[PDB]
RNA sequence: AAUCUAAAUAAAUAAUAAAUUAAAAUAAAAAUUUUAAAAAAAAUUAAAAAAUUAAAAUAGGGCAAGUCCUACUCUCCUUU
RNA sequence: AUUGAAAUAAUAAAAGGGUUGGGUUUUAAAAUCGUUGUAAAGCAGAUUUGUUUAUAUAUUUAAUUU
């Protein structure tokens, strides 16, 4: 029974505060295709004053018009924002944390202590892989905890479960900007009817099951893109009469790599092999490089 | 079957109540149990005094 | 708080206030009245479901198991199930008088009876019930098709009369030929077992003895007349009794402005 | 305990020392000495202190003779019997130191499946809570309790708090003496003592097994998970159930039977929402977001909150037995909301 | 103690008949009580005019035959269309009024019978059909007042 | 469906304290019970099943020391 | 004073089931080789005075008839 933290996030607030009461610079790993669904609910009232380094991953597939406003929004509030294609990997995102403190850090009173970094975000959007990439390499090349790297028991090699107490990853050394873990507080599974669509749309929570069939997100990625064009160019990419009238033809027109047991005279193709295609291809930013969220021009 | 033979879950004869604890033969074949008053496994099912009626509490 | 006219307790009172079959089948009757309930409550009677309207007047002189369900009701249902300006409405347990004391313990002299024969109208029907009792009349009676003596308008007109403050009232039956020619013979001739008769208070009047009695009564004259009708019919003449005195008024009066003139002094007080 | 006997040694209190005079009281049983000198404590309140050790000892010689209730006194040793007077302090002294209209006193009597001189078993309606949450407002069982006081017993005591959305069978004890006994029947079983029925949507893994999850209640409502296969050992307790999928909708639902060996919070529903990730039908608190009712041919109008959680506390094996030797097993029949989906599926609802 | 029985619930909703040279199913083709009441997900064909696949409709209940009395079965059935139109969903649980079956079911007049494909029609909770028209030949066993007074009694029976 | 009897000939193997038994019920011993006791009435023979009898004071968690392990600043007899 | 250390993750041997608590369970080729029960000793003109009963369910439905 290996589930995760399960409960409304708006009750994980007064405990998140005392976690920020001691931290210095707040981080976050989001998805630029989902500027405010991958955010914790308090992002508004979370800190308002600690220097946030809010990062949007997979930005190369998120649209560029909505990228400007979301950039200058926090950039007006003061809290910074950085967008990355992730092809140039987190190694450059790490470089940001080397630069995005030297300019904004308050000078350390004691020459070598830390810059205690509070990280948040969904573990499946890039926050896990960002920790366990810097957490694994610290075991070999050593900065603190000062022991001979032998006491890690059998079958762990990593510990993001059952201890996660004072556990923290030293990302840098001379400006030792360390980073916390924040035991995963996001995607509560009590999500909204629609948020699970935009979440499974982006490849996040890639589970497509009885809880969320392909034909429920595929109906969503089709009806979101009612403007046929540069998306019908993916349809026209597979012999489609450009405009699809509705969900029946376009999904059935793309059954060239789909099908099941059908007669030699009347073929009864398979619309689920066409479902996953239309679903999973939009995940790759292949069909269109367009966001999902609405980007409130107002403050909210 | 007239001759009978429909024995209960065990008890044979139960004596008078004498307050909360009522006796019972529990004839079956052996016992093991305990005892609230002095807790020692006490094979002697030939006589088990239940508490108010809870078969959980005995002798 | 019940802001819904579909509530069981609401539909309870309606079919208890207006319907008359499913009244006795539960032996209940709706009472309305802020002071009219305590009047009945004073002489040992507790409403089953006392529905106060949700508001200010909340006297609790019998609370804490006043035969509870002391429900607070919305203004909206205070209009529907309650024709009546009270914020204090309930329902009570039907009493009963025995149909045999009309037939056996017919006491001789001071026996003046009322009848009230017609398809009547509440308010008026209730009013007479208050005043007939208001002079200790015995054997107040029903007819072919008078309104039920527990109707909500009747109990509003009776104003504490229906319950046994002093009321040996009675109710009569339904007979074969869609009529009540057998309602009288079963009792009324036997209500001449004790002797005298009259048929006043009919819009039309005949013999008209007309309020002219001289002798103080020959006080020991152990016979005494009975009640009257409402409309004009000779149904009161097909019965065996040969008395036929249909009384009228004197001045320009009209309907209902004849009885309370008659019953006022045509009651027991012939001693004057 | 070694510290409990310390403060007992270092407490003046008033330490009502009680001599045992030559004539009247030397020889009498101690429980006679206390009960005719201290009329304030009930006798049962006097047995607890005399046996518990927060006792009225007796002191003759240089040590304290803690005693059973029947130990008799000594031949005028002026053998003082010390009794406690200001227990309140670090001691933490022991236990003992609206109106229900009809349509309720009747409603609470159709919810009775079994009654004898020692318990009362009821059939709780799915959706009525037990503890009050809107402290003046909610109609719960504890406010109803002075309705099952059949035969004028003293306000039955609730024994195991069924949850809000959980339907089913409850047990009250009719006697504060029986309630002490009926504790060992609930907490942390080894073998099952109760059956929970439910309609989880989605055929789980193998239709027999045991679930061991390690719950952790972070306030508010954190509700954590397996995190440690052994335990976090500090804030975690485990909840074990032996589930059996009695029958199964072919691949989209199942009728599961849980035998909850433990007593953890929503352990039925949180372990059901991660036995597969197939939660119970209408479980909007832990699962419940797959769809509104998880999108079936059931009553599907409001849905968003229409379908009540198909979870039912089905059977409890009481320890009181019956005229025939069998122990008694209440069999609270399913609510219509489960009788809906059982007959809509044609299963033989076993009452 | 005494693990008296596991699942115990299939035995309440299945027609289990021992095999003991006297109790035994048989292939049909012997007499009434033909055999094999078709107990699993069997993917019946739909026939009435809807978007039920008419080629696939997956089974729910563990019993289907008239010598097992389809006349009071309340046989649930789940719809699994391999395609409907690209009006029902491919995910709902409708009852079914079984029409015929390829299994050679012997009647009580020796009239053996078997059709090209086992088919059925979806109906509702009040036992009313969901379609307007039916495209197959039903079996005599659909004559009960159970599935008549709402069933169109489509056309030529057998 | 198909192949693998029996009897005839030939003959090994592990095992073996012996019983006067052994059906069946039923209480009695630091005990775990091989017996004994009351109460019963339990027949040969061949065949086939394995219910019982003839093959370890164990499995799983929670603790603490130990050997194994790595590491040398301080230890002993190394030899090379 | 005279070597000093490391959850040295596994082994071993112990205990145990305000500091303090998770675990609940018992086996892997069986000529049966003692009882057991199952069947049997092959044609009896013929059940059954009395032994002994693996014998086993009493209802979840549908459609009528008042």
Residues in chain A preceding a C-to-N separation beyond 2.5 angstroms (breaks)? none
Reported as type and span, the H/E element at residue A55 is strand A52-57
Mention every residue, 6+ apart, whose C-beta is less than 8 A from residue D281. Answer: D198, D199, D200, D201, D253, D293, D294, D307, D309, D310, D341
C near E: at least 3 beta-carbon pairs less than 8 Å apart: no
Dihedral sign of CA atoms A220, A226, A228, A231 in order: negative
Phi, psi values for residue C184, rounded to 5°? -80, -55
Q: Under DSSP, is residue E11 helix (H, G, I), strand (E, B) or coil?
A: helix
Q: Under DSSP, is residue E78 helix (H, G, I), strand (E, B) or coil?
A: strand
Cβ D247 vs Cβ E13: under 8 Å: yes
Reported as type and span, the H/E element at residue D51 is helix D43-52
**D325/B52 touch (CB, cutoff 8 Å), yes or no:** no
The shortest C-alpha distance from D242 to chain E (Å) reads: 12
Structural Rg of chain E based on CA atoms: 17
Q: Whose CA is closest to A201, among A223, A177, A218?
A: A218
Structural Rg of chain C based on CA atoms: 21
Chain C residues with CB inside 8 Å of D101's CB? 68-70
Which of left, alpha, beta for D227 (phi over 0: left; psi -120 to 50: alpha)? alpha
Beta strands in D75-187 (DSSP E): 81-83, 114-115, 120-124, 167-172
E38/F3 CA-to-C1' distance in Å: 36
The verdict on D298 touching C (C-beta cutoff 8 Å) is no
Q: Whose CA is closest to E92, among E58, E67, E141?
A: E58
Interior angle at CA A82, CA A81 and CA A86, nearest 5: 150
DSSP tally for chain A: helices H, then strands E = 9, 6
Tell me the C-alpha distance between A258 and A251, whole Å: 10
Structural Rg of chain D based on CA atoms: 27
**E82/A249 touch (CB, cutoff 8 Å), yes or no:** no
Half-sphere exposure in the Cβ direction for A99 (13 Å, CA): 9
**D319/B54 touch (CB, cutoff 8 Å), yes or no:** yes
Q: Whose CA is closest to E15, among E6, E7, E25?
A: E25
Place of tokens 């035994």: E24
CA of B31: nucleotide with nearest C1': F27
Tell me the C-alpha distance between D159 and D169, whole Å: 11
Residue D233: CB less than 7 A from any atom in strand G: yes
Mention every residue, 6+ apart, whose C-beta is less than 8 A from residue D114. Answer: D120, D121, D318, D328, D330
Q: Under DSSP, is residue A125 helix (H, G, I), strand (E, B) or coil?
A: helix
**B56/D116 touch (CB, cutoff 8 Å), yes or no:** no
Please identify residues in chain A, positions 151-190, with a C-beta within 7 angstroms of any atom of strand G.
151-154
Largest CA distance in chain A: 82
CA of B30: nucleotide with nearest C1': F27
Chain D residues with CB inside 8 Å of E60's CB? 249-250, 345
The verdict on D296 touching E (C-beta cutoff 8 Å) is yes
The shortest C-alpha distance from E155 to chain D (Å) reads: 28
Q: Which two tokens stand for residue D336?
A: 């219509």
Strands A169-170 and A117-118: unpaired
Tell me the C-alpha distance between A71 and A56, whole Å: 10
DSSP string, chain C: -B--TTSHHHHHHHHHHT-SHHHHTTTEEEEE-HHHHHHHHHTT---SS-EEESSS----TT-SSSSS--EEE-HHHHHHT--SS-SEEEEEE-----TTTTTS---SSS------BSS--TTHHHHHHHHHHHTT-S-----SSPPPTT-HHHHHHHTS-TTTSS---------TTSS-HHHHHHHTTTTTTS--------SS-SS--TT---S---S---------BSS--GGGGSSS---------SSS--TTTTHHHHHHHSSS-TT-
**A268/E83 touch (CB, cutoff 8 Å), yes or no:** yes
C near D: at least 3 beta-carbon pairs less than 8 Å apart: yes
E21/F3 CA-to-C1' distance in Å: 25
Q: Which candidate from B9, B11, B56 shows the least CB-CB separation from D319?
A: B56
Strands D311-317 and D167-172: parallel
Which other chains touch chain E, taking contact as 3+ CB pairs less than 8 Å apart?
A: A, D
E113/F2 CA-to-C1' distance in Å: 34
DSSP string, A238-281: GT--SS--SHHHHHHHTGGG---S--SSS----TTHHHHHHHHH
In the C/D pair of chains, how many CB contacts fall below 8 A? 10
Tell me the C-alpha distance between E107 and E28, whole Å: 10
Partners of E122 in beta bridges: E96
Mention every residue, 6+ apart, whose C-beta is less than 8 A from residue D235. Answer: D216
The verdict on B10 touching D (C-beta cutoff 8 Å) is yes
**D102/C69 touch (CB, cutoff 8 Å), yes or no:** yes
Tell me the C-alpha distance between C70 and D298, whole Å: 39
- Determination method here? cryo-EM
Torsion of CA E60, E64, E69, E70, to 10 degrees: 60
Half-sphere exposure in the Cβ direction for D158 (13 Å, CA): 18
Please identify residues in chain E, positions 105-144, with a C-beta within 7 angstroms of any atom of strand G.
144
Tell me the C-alpha distance between B56 and D319, whole Å: 6
Asked whether the bond before E70 is cis by omega within 30 degrees of 0, the reply is: no
DSSP string, A76-116: HHS-EEEE--SSS-HHHHHHHHHHHHHTTPPPPSSSS----
Sequence-distant contacts of A198-204: CB under 8 A, at least 24 apart: A198/A34, A198/A37, A198/A292, A198/A293, A199/A34, A199/A37, A201/A279, A201/A282, A201/A283, A201/A292, A202/A31, A202/A33, A202/A34, A202/A58, A202/A283, A202/A292, A203/A280, A203/A283, A204/A31, A204/A34, A204/A38, A204/A122, A204/A124, A204/A125
**A7/D222 touch (CB, cutoff 8 Å), yes or no:** yes
Resolution of this model in Å is 3.4
Cβ D83 vs Cβ D34: under 8 Å: yes
Q: Under DSSP, is residue D27 helix (H, G, I), strand (E, B) or coil?
A: coil
The shortest C-alpha distance from A191 to chain D (Å) reads: 7
Chain A residues with CB inside 8 Å of E86's CB? 247-249, 251-252, 271
């Amino acid at each position: 029974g290996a589930a995760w933290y399960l409960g409304h996030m708006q009750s994980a607030a007064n405990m998140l505060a005392d976690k920020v009461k001691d931290a210095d610079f707040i981080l976050e790993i989001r998805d630029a295709r989902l500027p405010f669904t991958t955010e914790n609910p308090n992002i508004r009232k979370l800190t308002a004053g600690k220097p946030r380094l809010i990062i949007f991953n997979k930005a190369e597939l998120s649209n560029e018009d909505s990228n400007r406003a979301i950039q200058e929004y926090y950039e007006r509030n003061g809290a910074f924002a950085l967008f990355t294609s992730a092809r140039r990997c987190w190694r450059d995102v790490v470089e940001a944390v080397q630069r995005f403190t030297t300019h904004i850090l308050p000078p350390l009173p004691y020459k070598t202590v830390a810059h205690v970094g509070l990280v948040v975000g969904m573990p499946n959007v890039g926050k896990s892989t960002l920790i366990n990439s810097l957490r694994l390499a610290h075991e070999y090349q050593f900065h603190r905890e000062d022991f001979r790297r032998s006491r890690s028991p059998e079958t762990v090699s990593i510990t993001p479960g059952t201890t996660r107490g004072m556990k923290l990853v030293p990302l840098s050394k001379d400006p030792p900007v360390v980073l916390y873990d924040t035991p995963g507080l996001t995607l509560p599974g009590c999500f909204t009817k629609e948020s699970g669509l935009k979440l499974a749309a982006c490849g996040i929570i890639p589970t497509n099951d009885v809880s969320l069939p392909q034909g429920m997100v595929a109906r969503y990625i089709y009806d979101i893109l009612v403007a046929s064009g540069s998306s019908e160019h993916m349809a026209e990419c597979l012999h489609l009469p450009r405009v699809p009238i509705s969900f029946d033809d376009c999904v059935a027109m793309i059954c060239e790599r789909s099908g099941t047991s059908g007669q030699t005279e009347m073929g009864n193709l398979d619309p689920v092999r066409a479902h996953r295609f239309f679903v999973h291809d939009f995940i790759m930013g292949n069909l269109g490089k367009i966001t999902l969220d609405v980007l409130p021009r107002r403050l909210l | 079957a007239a001759a009978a033979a429909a024995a209960a879950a065990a008890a044979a004869a139960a004596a008078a109540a004498a307050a909360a604890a009522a006796a019972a033969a529990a004839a079956a074949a052996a016992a093991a149990a305990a005892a609230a008053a002095a807790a020692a496994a006490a094979a002697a099912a030939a006589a088990a005094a239940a508490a108010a009626a809870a078969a959980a509490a005995a002798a | 708080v019940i802001d819904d006219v579909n509530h069981a307790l609401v539909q309870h009172f309606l079919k208890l206030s207006t319907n008359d079959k499913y009244r006795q089948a539960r032996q209940m009757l709706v009472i309305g009245g802020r002071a009219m309930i305590e009047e009945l409550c004073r002489a040992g009677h507790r409403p089953r479901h006392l529905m106060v309207e949700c508001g200010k007047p909340i006297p609790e002189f019998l609370h804490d198991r006043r035969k509870t369900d002391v429900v607070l009701v919305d203004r909206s249902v205070s209009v529907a199930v309650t024709p009546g300006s009270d914020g204090y409405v309930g329902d009570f347990a039907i009493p009963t008088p025995p149909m045999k004391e009309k037939l056996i313990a017919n006491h001789q002299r001071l026996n003046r009876v009322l009848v009230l024969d017609n398809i009547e109208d509440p308010g008026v029907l209730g009013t007479l019930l208050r005043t007939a009792s208001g002079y200790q009349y015995d054997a107040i009676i029903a007819t072919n098709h008078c309104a039920d003596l527990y109707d909500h308008r009747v109990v509003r007109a009776a104003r504490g009369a229906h319950f046994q403050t002093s009321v040996p009232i009675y109710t009569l039956k339904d007979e074969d030929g869609d009529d009540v020619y057998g309602l009288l013979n079963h009792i009324v001739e036997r209500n001449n077992l004790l002797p005298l008769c009259y048929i006043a208070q009919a819009d039309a009047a005949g013999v008209d003895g007309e309020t002219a009695g001289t002798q103080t009564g020959f006080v020991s004259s152990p016979e005494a007349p009975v009640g009257r009708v409402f409309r004009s019919s000779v149904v009161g003449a097909a019965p065996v009794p040969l008395p036929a005195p249909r009384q009228s008024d004197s001045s320009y009066a009209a309907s209902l402005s004849r009885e309370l003139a008659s019953v006022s002094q045509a009651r027991e007080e012939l001693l004057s | 305990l070694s510290l409990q006997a310390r403060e007992e040694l270092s407490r003046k209190s008033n330490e009502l020392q009680y001599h045992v005079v030559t004539q009247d009281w030397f020889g009498q049983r101690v429980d006679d000495f206390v009960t005719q000198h201290h009329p304030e404590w009930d006798y049962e309140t006097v047995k607890r202190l005399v046996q518990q050790g927060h006792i009225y000892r007796y002191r003759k010689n240089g040590k304290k003779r803690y005693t059973r209730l029947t130990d008799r006194l000594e031949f005028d040793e002026l053998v003082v019997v010390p009794t406690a007077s200001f227990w309140e302090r670090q001691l933490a002294p022991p236990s003992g130191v609206f109106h229900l209209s009809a349509k309720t006193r009747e409603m609470a009597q159709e919810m009775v499946l079994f009654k004898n001189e020692h318990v009362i078993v009821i059939n709780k309606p799915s959706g009525v809570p037990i503890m009050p949450t809107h402290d003046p407002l909610a109609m719960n069982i504890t406010d109803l309790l002075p309705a099952w006081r059949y035969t004028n017993t003293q306000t039955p005591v609730i024994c195991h708090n069924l949850d809000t959305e959980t339907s089913g069978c409850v047990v009250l004890a009719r006697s504060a003496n029986t309630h002490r006994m009926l504790g060992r029947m609930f907490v942390k079983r080894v073998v099952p003592n109760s059956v929970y029925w439910g309609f989880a949507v989605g055929k789980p893994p193998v239709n027999f097994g045991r679930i061991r999850m390690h719950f952790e209640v972070q306030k508010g409502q954190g509700g954590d998970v397996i995190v440690a296969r052994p335990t976090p050992t500090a804030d975690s307790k485990v909840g074990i159930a032996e589930f059996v999928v009695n029958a199964s909708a072919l691949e989209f639902g199942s009728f599961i039977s849980f035998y909850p060996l433990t007593t953890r919070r929503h352990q039925e529903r949180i372990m059901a929402a991660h036995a597969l990730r197939a939660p119970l039908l209408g479980d909007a608190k832990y699962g419940g977001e797959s769809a509104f009712p998880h999108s079936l041919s059931l009553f599907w109008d409001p849905a968003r909150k229409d379908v009540p959680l198909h979870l039912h506390h089905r059977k409890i094996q009481l320890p009181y037995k019956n005229g025939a030797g069998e122990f008694v097993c209440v069999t609270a029949p399913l609510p219509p909301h489960m009788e809906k989906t059982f007959k809509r599926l044609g299963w033989p609802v076993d009452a | 103690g005494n693990p008296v029985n596991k699942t115990w619930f299939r035995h309440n909703l299945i027609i289990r008949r021992k095999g003991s040279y006297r109790s035994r199913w048989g292939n049909g083709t012997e007499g009434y009580g033909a055999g094999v009441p078709l107990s699993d997900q069997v993917k019946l064909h739909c026939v009435d005019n809807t978007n039920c696949k008419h080629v696939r409709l997956i089974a729910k209940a563990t019993a289907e035959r008239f010598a097992h009395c389809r006349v009071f079965p309340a046989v649930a059935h789940r719809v699994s269309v391999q395609r409907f139109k690209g009006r029902v969903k491919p995910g709902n649980i409708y009852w079914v009024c079984l029409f015929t079956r390829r299994q050679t079911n012997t009647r009580m007049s020796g009239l053996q019978t078997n059709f090209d494909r086992n088919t059925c029609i979806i109906m509702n909770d009040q036992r009313v059909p969901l379609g307007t028209r039916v495209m197959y030949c039903a079996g005599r066993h659909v004559n009960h007042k159970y599935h008549l007074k709402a069933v169109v009694l489509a056309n030529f029976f057998v």
